[model samples]
Target: NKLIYSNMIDKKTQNSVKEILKENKINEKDIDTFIKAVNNYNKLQVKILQNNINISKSGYSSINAKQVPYNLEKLQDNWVKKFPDYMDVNCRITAFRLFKDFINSNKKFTGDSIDLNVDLDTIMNNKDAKFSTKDVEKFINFFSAIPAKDTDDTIKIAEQIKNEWKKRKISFKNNKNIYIINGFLRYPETKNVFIGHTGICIKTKNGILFLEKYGVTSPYQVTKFKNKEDVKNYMFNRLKMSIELPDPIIMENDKLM
Candidate 1:
C-alpha cells in the first residue's frame, strides 16, 4: 500500500498507486503492523485488486474513495487503547511502530511539550513567510492538515501561532503541512475531550462510525471523532469546518490508495 499527502492529490502519485493494484498478493508482511491492517479495512484498494486482474487494462474506474458508509466498531476496537480520550476513530495509522519509532528516533520529539495547536497558533502570528510544503510534512509527517484552500487566511493564522511561540522562545520551522489557525483546538466531544477539525469514520449496520485524528501520525493531532452525529455536533459547535477551504489547506480527509 502507498500513502499520499492528503492535502495535495498528485495525479502522478495517484497513478503510481494504481499501478500497485495489479499485485494479486498483498505484502502480508506489510500487514504486520496495526496501521496497515486498519488501512485495508473497507478500503477498496485491496478489494479492487481482487476484481481487476491487470491494472493497465482496468483503467481509472477501479480507482476511487467511495464514501460508502462503513462501521467503525472494528476500527474503534483496534484503536481505542491509544486514543481512549477520542470519541471518533477516523484517520490513518499505518504503523504505530513506524510512528513510535519515528518519535523515539528523535529525542526532541518528546510528547510532553509538543502541542500542534500551539505550534499552529505560533506560526499564525509570526509574520514570517508562509510555511513551505516541507515545513508541514516534516513536523508531523502525515498527509492530513497540510495547507489547503483559504491558505492565505490560514497562513495569516500561522503568523499568529508563530508569534505566540516566539513569546515563549519556542522556535519551530513551519512546513507546508502545518498551518497556524486562530480557532480553539479544544472543542467539546461526547467523550468529554476537546477535538478539532478532520475526522475518520465508517458506516456500520447502525449509526455512522466516527473517527478523529490524533497523535502526530494523524492530523488534528491529539483529537478524533467516531460518528456522523459527533462530526455534525463538532462542526455545528465550531463553525470553522467550512466546505470552501481549498484541498491543500483543509485537514486530510479519507485518503485512498
Candidate 2:
C-alpha cells in the first residue's frame, strides 16, 4: 500500500493510507527509513573502503589500530563530547563495544580471526551488559563476518554487517521480523525539538513493554504500554522524519542491502 501524506491526498485516499499504515504499524513506531538509510550508507562506505586500497588515508584511520586502549563506558561518555559531529550511535556500535571488551579481556586469542562467541555468555552476564544471548551472538556474528586486516575498512563494515545479520535471520523483503533501531524522535509539543531515542517493543504476558534508551547515559529502560494502539500512538506522536534520507524506504532486501 502507498504511504502518502494526508494533506497531499483526497480524504478517501488518505483514509486508505491511514489504514495501511495502521495495519503495518508503520505510521507509529516504524524504523524502516532509519534501517534503510544505515544499510545504504554502510554499503556505500564498504565499497569506498574496499576500493580505496590505501588504508592510511581512509576516514576511519584515526581509530584503526591493532592495539588501542578503549574503555566502553568511558568512550561512550566521551564520544559525543569529543566528536559531536563525527560520532554516530547505533546497534552495531553498541554491540561492538561489548565485543571489544570481550576480545580485550581474553589476551590469549590474539589474532585477526578469533571466535567471538567464546566466553560470550560470561561477557553478556557482566553487570554492565544488558543485552540478551541471541542479540549478543548476532552482534558477534555481524562483526566477525567483516575482514579485519585493515582496521579502518572493518570500521566501515558496521552498518552493513548489521544488515547481514538481519538478512541471515529474516526475510527482509517481506518484513518477517520486528526490527530495532537507534534513532531520534521529535517532541510532540515542540516542532523542532528532537531527542536521541531507541526502542524495541516485545509482547509480554502482561502487555507490550518497550525496551528502550532515550539519552546517552541511560541504560536499558523499559516502558509499559496498554496495547498496540497505545504503543502506536506514542510513537506516532513523537516520531520524527529522517533528515538525511529524502525518500520513504521501500522494504526490499536487495534494495536496502
Candidate 3:
C-alpha cells in the first residue's frame, strides 16, 4: 500500500499525463491522486488477468469482476466507505446519479439515458422518465458495453439511441454541459469491444468534476479533474493493459466510433 510513485507508474504514461495536466491548465496535484486510484484498480486488474476464460457459444468471452479474491474484497470494502456522502460508488450507477441530480434541478436531460426494462418511447415522448429500480439494470448493461458492428456488440442499440437524439435535436447544446465517459475493455481474445467502466464529468467553476465508480464493486468517487482529455487519459491510463486488444476506446459522451 505504501508503494513509491516512481515504481507504480511508467515513464511514458506519467509524462503523457503530465503533458495533459499542463495543457489543460488545472491543478497537477490531482494527478497524484489519479496515480493512487490507478494503483488500487491495478490490484483488481492483476487478479482478473490471471483468470482463464472460455468463450461462450457465441464466441464472446469476458472476465468477471465480481470474483475478486477475499483479500482484495477486504481492501475494496475499505475503499467503498472511505469517503463521506456515501459518494463511494460503482461505475454504472454514477451516470444516473448525476443525471438524477440534473433532472431534479429542473434541467431537461433529453439525452439518451437508456432504460431498457421500461418503454424508452415513454421517456422520449415525455422526456421525463421516472427512474425506477429496473432502470439501474439498464445502466449496468449500458456501462459494461461499447458499440460494435457485429450482433454481439451493443453498437446496434447504441446507434439507435444516438440517431434518435440527432434526429430530435432541435439542438444538443442542451446537455452539452455533461460529458459521459464510457470505458471499453478489449482483450486479445475477446470478440467484442465491451464497455467495462463508466463516469460523468460536468463543468465546474474550478475545473471539471469527475464522478466515477472506481471500478466494479468499488467505491464511487467525485475526483476533480482538469479537462476531458485528462479524464479520458486518466481512464485510458488506468484501463489500458498490455494484453488488452489494441486501442481500447474510452469515448466522452458516447461518441464511440
Candidate 4:
C-alpha cells in the first residue's frame, strides 16, 4: 500500500523474474508471449507444490547468501572473497539492487510514489565505507537516538521507529502483513549474529511470506504455513533478523554500494 509495501515484493523473486525476463527478453511489443511464459511458470510451480514436491530454496540456499551457514569451519574463501558479508550484506545489497531496478524500470507504472532512499551511491563511493560501514553506523546512530525513558520500555525502539518513520514521511500505521525473514535457514552456526539476514511476514489466512530476493527467487509470494506456532517458531528462530532492528532500514545496499 506504500513504498515499504512495494518492497514487500520479495528480493529473490525480483532477481529470478529479472533473469527469466532477461533470458526471454520480454518487451512491450510481445506482451502476450511474456504473459504466457510467466503463466506457464506459475502453473508449473503450482502443480509441483500441489504434488508436495518441495521447491528447495534455490537462489540464496544455493549461493550461501545467509548470515550463518550450516558449517562455519567450511567457509569457502573464494565465495567470501566475492561476497565478504554473505548473510546480511548480501540480502541488503540484493534488496537495494532490486529496488533500483524497480524504480528505474517501473517508473511509469501506476503505483504509489517510492522514496528511492536506498544508500548504494554513498556506501560504494565513500572512502570511509570500509572503516565504518554505512549500514552499521546509521543503524547505531538511529538506535542510539531513541528515548529510553518510556512507558513500554521493550518497544521503545519500535516507538522510536514509529516516530522516526513519521519524521521521514513514511507511514507505519495500518500494516497488516507480518514478514518472517529466513536469514539463517542456510547457516545455523551464525546463531544470533544478525543484521537483517532473513525476514518472514504473516498475512491473512496464516500465510508465510518469505522475502529472499538478493540471491535469486520470486517476488514476495505468500506461502501458507501450517499454524501460528509454526510461523512463530520460524520467525523467532530461523530467519535470524535482529529483534532489535529499527523501523525502516538505514544501511541498505543502495546506500552502501
Residue 26's lDDT within candidate 4 is: 34
* C-alpha positional error of residue 45 in candidate 3 after TM-score superposition, expressed in Å: 20
| TM-scores, each model vs. reference | 0.26, 0.28, 0.44, 0.35
Q: State in Å the error of residue 69, model 4.
A: 6.2
Task: For candidate 2, give the lDDT.
Answer: 0.33
- In candidate 3, position 244 carries an lDDT of 19
Better of 3 and 4 by TM-score: 3
The lowest-lDDT stretch of 10 consecutive residues in candidate 4 is: 104-113
Residues 1-257, model 1: lDDT tens digits: 11111210233433433233213122333323333323433242333323433222222222132121122243445435543443322222222211212221112232322335444443344221124334433344332122212233434434433443333334323222221221223212221111234333333334332323332222221112233444444433333433442221222121110
Question: What order do you get sorting by lDDT, best first?
Answer: 3, 2, 4, 1
Rate residue 185 of model 3 by lDDT.
60
lDDT of 4 by residue, 1-257 (tens): 00111221234644554443344323332333323333433342343333322232333222222222222122233334444542212334333222222211111222211211223332454221221343333332221222223233323434444454344333212323432232211112321112334333333443343333322112222233445444444334434343443232222211210
- Give the number of colliding residue pairs in candidate 4: 34
Model 3 global lDDT (CA atoms, 0 to 1): 0.44
Residue 221 lDDT in model 4?
26
- Report the C-alpha displacement of residue 50, candidate 2, in angstroms: 49
Q: Which scores greater on TM-score, model 1 or model 4? A: 4
